[PDB]
Amino acid sequence: SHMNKICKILNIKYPVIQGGMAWVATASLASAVSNAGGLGIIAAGNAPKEAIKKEIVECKKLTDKPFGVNVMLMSPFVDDIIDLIIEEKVQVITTGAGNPAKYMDRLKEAGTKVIPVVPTIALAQRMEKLGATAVIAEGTEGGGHIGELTTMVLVPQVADAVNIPVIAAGGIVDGRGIAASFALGASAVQVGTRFICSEECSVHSNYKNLVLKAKDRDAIVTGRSTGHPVRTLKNKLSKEFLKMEQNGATPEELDKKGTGALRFATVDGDIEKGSFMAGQSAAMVKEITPCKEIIEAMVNQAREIMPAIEL
Amino acid sequence: HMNKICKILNIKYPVIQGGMAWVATASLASAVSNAGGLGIIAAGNAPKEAIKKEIVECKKLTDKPFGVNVMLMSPFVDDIIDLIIEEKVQVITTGAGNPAKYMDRLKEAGTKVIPVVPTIALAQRMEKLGATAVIAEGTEGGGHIGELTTMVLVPQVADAVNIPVIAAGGIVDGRGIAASFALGASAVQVGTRFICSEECSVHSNYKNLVLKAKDRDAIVTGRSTGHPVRTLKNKLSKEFLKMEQNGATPEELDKKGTGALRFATVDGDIEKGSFMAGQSAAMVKEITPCKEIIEAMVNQAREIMPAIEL
Ligand SMILES: Cc1cc2nc3c(=O)[nH]c(=O)nc-3n(C[C@H](O)[C@H](O)[C@H](O)COP(=O)(O)O)c2cc1C
Ligand SMILES: Cc1cc2nc3c(=O)[nH]c(=O)nc-3n(C[C@H](O)[C@H](O)[C@H](O)COP(=O)(O)O)c2cc1C
Ligand SMILES: CS(=O)(=O)c1ccc2nc(NC(=O)Cc3csc(-n4cccc4)n3)sc2c1
Ligand SMILES: CS(=O)(=O)c1ccc2nc(NC(=O)Cc3csc(-n4cccc4)n3)sc2c1
Ligand code: NA
Ligand code: NA
Ligand code: NA
Ligand code: NA
């Protein structure tokens, strides 16, 4: 009674999930978040089965606490990643960038808890009917491939539509966003951009530093002309990509410009060729900090702001 | 008055009914003020004489504080500022620009000025030039929007200024009030929810389109002109989008959208109107007296956040 539902179901100390973040989120980050009492997440991204297997194996060496894997449903290896989840006995997965409906029964029967990101009420309701453990309502202010609705309106609508716990994502960097999210009906938060600037995140230092330097309007959106808006920091790449879209460049021309761009950011920190994906939250990130300090300060500040909060 | 905005504005509840061009007339503004919030008469694009009539009629309907919104893109903005000072309006909000050039005239007149700000820089500039408070309006609001969402804009503006911050964009009930106060706001400004108040004088069809709006119905037109507008999906707003996808020019769009908001508010023309509204429209489910809207909001916020400083 009076216990946080996400903490109880996932067996974690704090209802803070570090979001799966393609290329960004590796065993160093996931294990640090789980060791700090939240839920670390290894991102499958577009990587093949054998690469994510190594991350899972390495993560289990670094933490005894629960962690998850994010299945990014647009991946060409999505079927292999789902196999890997079940083979490796991963306790929990999140999903993004699509509808995981066709895997829910295999995952549910295998005991895996499934937490899909949902950008609409209809998908939230469908996920609850197919047996989702929880859903993540990610607002458009988040980094990466975004939906249309903001966190402020999406979280309460999803909470009104389903009875399973709702996890707020998009724009949360500190205890203020946690308290706001819980007031809107969430039982936990998922945090991406802030954890790029954790010490244990393995991205190139230039990526962390560009997030630190980000100003209020620096997290721009490319790909609106098409069907998949992507939020990323202003730099030479993203500005020229946006101009190419606006000047009617072909789907092929755009493909070559953007191919490998996120990896150029995370591996090489290449400030001219990288796509430094980040939410509008990037403007509020001010320090590189160990995950333990981030999470403990997050929950303490949420309590101070909203003493009634059910953490 | 413990709450800072309640003290400064001498109102019972820190709930402001946002100025809403063509929508917010004396009937709505007086009802909100009578209910203990701050009603606002929208100057919009209208001339001095039309807005003067609204101020006079509002005074006949309430003796509670109310304000006027100066919409800074109006062709008559100079006349409206003149009117504000001439009629000794106690408080104004501003939108759609930077009211820097009026701040000395307004502060010598004693006018409390509360500008809408979409950036940290404009927030800090308004504080430096004497703003009483600022409104941080997130992109989820209706009408001519900024880019940043409420979730990230409110805490950044609160971190940037010492004057009170008013959250706007997406607030329809006490959850949004509690969330806004958690982010650092001292009050909320609410637009779309009050379209579905009994006292709002828009055509019934406008209220219905808000009532029946789905989660994704409040779409953005005019990205290609640099003046984005959030409005409900309908024949007019689809065609505006289909025109942009066909490479329409700004002049073609501007002629297409002429008088569209008036078609919505006066005639309720479901095909020809621009029914501007926030993503909040999806959450609006009842047409309700303003007093009940505001009392229910405040009571719910206190229930969620017992220590809230309302
Ligand atoms: C660089 C980056 C990569 C991401 N990759 C994924 C992904 O592969 N799968 C997914 O579901 N979400 C992905 N996300 C979304 C995050 O998991 C998270 O929901 C989002 O970052 C939260 O918003 P915030 O950045 O404002 O904290 C990514 C976000 C970023 C910034
Ligand atoms: C139809 C409509 C007209 C508006 N007109 C104005 C205006 O003239 N001046 C202004 O500053 N804001 C204007 N706004 C913004 C509102 O004052 C308010 O900040 C916004 O509606 C809050 O977001 P919400 O609709 O989600 O509650 C308008 C909003 C709407 C929906
Ligand atoms: C592997 S990568 O480098 O190409 C890459 C980079 C960034 C990125 N960011 C993503 N963000 C999500 O997946 C979360 C989300 C928002 S809306 C939505 N959704 C839509 C239908 C169903 C869910 N999911 S995926 C993704 C993939
Ligand atoms: C008179 S009308 O029918 O043509 C019309 C219709 C809708 C409408 N909605 C508006 N919304 C705002 O003014 C609030 C806002 C958001 S961002 C911003 N801002 C940018 C720089 C400085 C402030 N102001 S004005 C406006 C005018
Ligand atoms: Na995303
Ligand atoms: Na920053
Ligand atoms: Na607006
Ligand atoms: Na509705």
User: Distance from the CA of A237 to the center of ligand 7, in angstroms?
Assistant: 31
**A185: nearest CA partner in chain B:** B175
Instruction: Please give the span between the terminal C-alpha atoms of chain A, in angstroms, as a whole number.
Output: 12
Residue B217: DSSP 8-state: -
Note whether B148 contacts A280, CB cutoff 8 Å. Answer: yes
Within 8 A by CB and 6+ apart from B283, the residues are A153, A156, A157, A160, B172, B173, B193
Strands of the sheet containing A230-233, edge to edge, are A144-145, A230-233, A219-222
B279 annotated binding-site participant: no
Using a 6 Å cutoff on CB, does residue A144 contact ligand 3? Answer: yes
- Which amino acid appears at position A195 of this protein? F
Return the structure tokens found at B167: 């959250």
**C-alpha of A26 from chain center:** 12
- B232 min Cα distance to partner chain A (Å): 14
Using a 6 Å cutoff on CB, does residue A281 contact ligand 1? Answer: yes
- B87 min Cα distance to partner chain A (Å): 37
Within 8 A by CB and 6+ apart from A179, the residues are A301, A302, A305, A306, A309, B179, B182
A-B contacts at Cβ under 8 angstroms:
119
Return the structure tokens found at B11: 């109102």
Return the structure tokens found at B262: 């008036």
B91, β-bridge pairs: B67, B112
Return the structure tokens found at B126: 């308004």
- B225 min Cα distance to partner chain A (Å): 12
Q: Is the dihedral of CA A125, A167, A172, A280 positive or negative?
A: negative
Instruction: Please give the span between the terminal C-alpha atoms of chain B, in angstroms, as a whole number.
Output: 9
**C-alpha of A154 from chain center:** 16
Note whether B151 contacts A153, CB cutoff 8 Å. Answer: no
Only one residue has tokens 């499934």, namely A114
Separation between Cα atoms, residue B173 and residue B63, nearest integer Å:
26
B305, β-bridge pairs: none
Return the structure tokens found at A151: 């966190």
User: Distance from the CA of A150 to the center of ligand 7, in angstroms?
Assistant: 15
Which residue from B23, B70, B144 has its CB within 8 A of the most atoms of ligand 4, so it is best to mutate?
B144
Pairing of strands A188-191, A166-169: parallel
Q: How many domains does chain A have?
A: 1
Note whether A180 contacts B149, CB cutoff 8 Å. Answer: no
- A225 min Cα distance to partner chain B (Å): 9
Note whether A150 contacts B156, CB cutoff 8 Å. Answer: no
B220, β-bridge pairs: B230
Note whether A284 contacts B156, CB cutoff 8 Å. Answer: yes
3-state secondary structure chain A: CCCCHHHHHHCCCCCEEECCCCCCCCHHHHHHHHHCCCEEEEECCCCCHHHHHHHHHHHHHHCCCCEEEEEECCCCCHHHHHHHHHHCCCCEEEEECCCCHHHHHHHHHCCCEEEEEECCHHHHHHHHHCCCCCEEEECCCCCEECCCCCHHHHHHHHHHHCCCCEEEECCCCCHHHHHHHHHHCCCEEEECHHHHCECCCCCCHHHHHHHHHCCCCCEEEECCCCCCCEEEECCHHHHHHHHHHHCCCCHHHHHHHHCCHHHHHHCCCCCCCCCCECCHHHHHCCCCECHHHHHHHHHHHHHHHCCCCCC
Using DSSP's 3-state secondary structure scheme, residue B119 falls into coil
- Identify the domain containing residue A135 by its residue range: 1-311
- The closest CB to that of A152, out of B121, B150, B306, belongs to B150
Using a 6 Å cutoff on CB, does residue B72 contact ligand 2? Answer: no
Only one residue has tokens 């999930």, namely A17
Note whether A152 contacts B139, CB cutoff 8 Å. Answer: no
CA neighbours within 13 Å on the CB side: how many for B191? 34
Q: Is the dihedral of CA B267, B270, B271, B274 positive or negative?
A: positive
A219, β-bridge pairs: A233
Return the structure tokens found at B65: 């504080």
Note whether A141 contacts B120, CB cutoff 8 Å. Answer: no
Q: Which atom of ligand 4 is nearest to the CA of B262?
A: 3
- Nearest residue CA, atom 13 of ligand 4? B95
- B62 min Cα distance to partner chain A (Å): 32
A221, β-bridge pairs: A231
Within 8 A by CB and 6+ apart from B310, the residues are B3, B6, B13, B14, B177, B298, B301, B302
User: Distance from the CA of B149 to the center of ligand 4, in angstroms?
Assistant: 15
Note whether B182 contacts A179, CB cutoff 8 Å. Answer: yes
A281 annotated binding-site participant: yes
CA neighbours within 13 Å on the CB side: how many for B40? 29
Ligand lying nearest the CA atom of residue B196: 8
Contact A129, A107 (CB under 8 A): no
Q: Residue B66 phi/psi, 5° resolution?
A: -140, 170
- Spell out which residues of chain B touch residue A305, defining contact as CB-CB under 8 Å: 182
For residue A274, give the nearest of A285, A257, A262 by alpha carbon: A262
For residue A25, give the nearest of A96, A128, A105 by alpha carbon: A96
User: Distance from the CA of B22 to the center of ligand 4, in angstroms?
Assistant: 12
Pairing of strands A40-43, B165-168: unpaired
Return the structure tokens found at B51: 């807005």
- The closest CB to that of A216, out of B156, B216, B223, belongs to B156
- Nearest residue CA, atom 10 of ligand 3? A145
CA distances from A116 to A94, A102, A123 (A): 5, 13, 9
Using a 6 Å cutoff on CB, does residue B45 contact ligand 4? Answer: yes
Separation between Cα atoms, residue B218 and residue B118, nearest integer Å:
19
CA distances from B260 to A228, B19, B20, B45 (A): 30, 18, 14, 13
For residue B94, give the nearest of B107, B112, B82 by alpha carbon: B112
Residue B246: DSSP 8-state: T
Q: Is the dihedral of CA B58, B59, B61, B63 positive or negative?
A: positive
Resolution in A: 1.7
**B159: nearest CA partner in chain A:** A284
